[PDB]
Design a protein around this ligand. Sequence first.
Ligand SMILES: CC(=O)c1ccc(OCC(=O)O)cc1
Length: 297
Amino acid sequence: MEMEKEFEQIDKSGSWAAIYQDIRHEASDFPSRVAKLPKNKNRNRYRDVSPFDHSRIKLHQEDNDYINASLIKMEEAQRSYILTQGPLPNTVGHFWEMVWEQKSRGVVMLNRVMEKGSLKCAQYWPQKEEKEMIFEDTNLKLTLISEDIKSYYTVRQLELENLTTQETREILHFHYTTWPDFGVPESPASFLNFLFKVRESGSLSPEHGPVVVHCSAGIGRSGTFCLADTCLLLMDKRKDPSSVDIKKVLLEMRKFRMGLIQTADQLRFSYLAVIEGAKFIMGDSSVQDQWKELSHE
Ligand SMILES: CC(=O)c1ccc(OCC(=O)O)cc1
């Protein structure tokens, strides 16, 4: 069923809250035993958001290999993502160790450091060229190289140095600075313009480790980003926008991490993003320039 027609049917009937609860009801449930070990309590931001044991990312150290992060492997789309929580004051070292060990090129951040007058994650990257960060626990140095600021989003070139070997890599930081907590982005066009900037960087390409995507919990906003990327990619491969069921893609993604898409509005936006983005995948290249203009970046 063409999702555009499923969309208008759900919209006119106002059954978004009902569709969403069906997804919640059928969603996978797997053990999270390592997350809930007492030694890992200060490594989790929320008590009710845990990585499954089968899909969790492991840190390469004998001490404690635990981080709140999950590998989402989409077999048909041939894309991988790591979804993680906003780093805590005591996990900033672990976060950059994961980025290093997994060979990621890109970090995608969908939240602000402060929202609704509370702290949603640590200031985990440097704000000035000449004030580099050193993570003593994981033996890494991080330096801001350059910054490109636009209306709603900012791209940063960072240099990550393994102090043990003196190897260095360029990491790209893609920061979306407009997405309300437990809410959907402003226009659909604006979100999509951000999505294509990440793609054009090569951060999502198979010659690199998986991209690291996060917000506060790493399930709501983060869920919306990788659901829309994967659905549009599946449209390109078989060329049948019709042969794409967004609900079934979501349930597949929820076998790897719990609670992806947190509200019935996030589910609705996801539909809007994919329907609007499909007006490109299917050969209207101009629409890209239109999104950029409509986004007023
Ligand atoms: C194998 C894989 O990544 C996958 C792709 C798509 C899935 O549902 C949607 C559909 O088939 O239209 C489920 C899983």
